[PDB]
């Protein structure tokens, strides 16, 4: 019982150029070699994510702008959020986010 979902709305009115203000990186199963999703590698202390006050490194992504990523590779997912954050989420000024983090 050390897992909790986190849905956040990240405004990038200014970060629109930086995408949002975070570095993403996903893993891959050891044997299955299947993408294990993306994880916040490093949040730009200043971007939209860091300003949101709800984004923290080591947070696994599940859905961005109402678009799940579990149905795609890490690179595809990070790219899916990239476009979703700089094309659909920015359109209004903020992108919807859904990440899962373990209690630690």
């Amino acid at each position: 019982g050390t897992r909790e979902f986190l849905t956040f709305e990240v405004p990038l009115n200014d970060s629109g150029s930086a995408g949002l203000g975070v570095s993403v990186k996903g893993n891959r199963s050891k044997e299955n070699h299947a993408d294990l999703g993306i994880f916040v590698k490093s949040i730009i202390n200043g971007g939209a994510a860091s300003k949101d006050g709800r984004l923290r490194v080591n947070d696994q992504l599940i859905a961005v702008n109402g678009e799940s990523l579990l149905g795609k590779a890490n690179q595809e997912a990070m790219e899916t959020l990239r476009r979703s954050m700089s094309t659909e989420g920015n359109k209004r000024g903020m992108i919807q986010l859904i990440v899962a983090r373990r209690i630690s």
Partner: peptide, 11 residues
Amino acid sequence: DEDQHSQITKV
């Protein structure tokens, strides 16, 4: 448990 071939993407 990565394959030592990960990568980061600035978003």
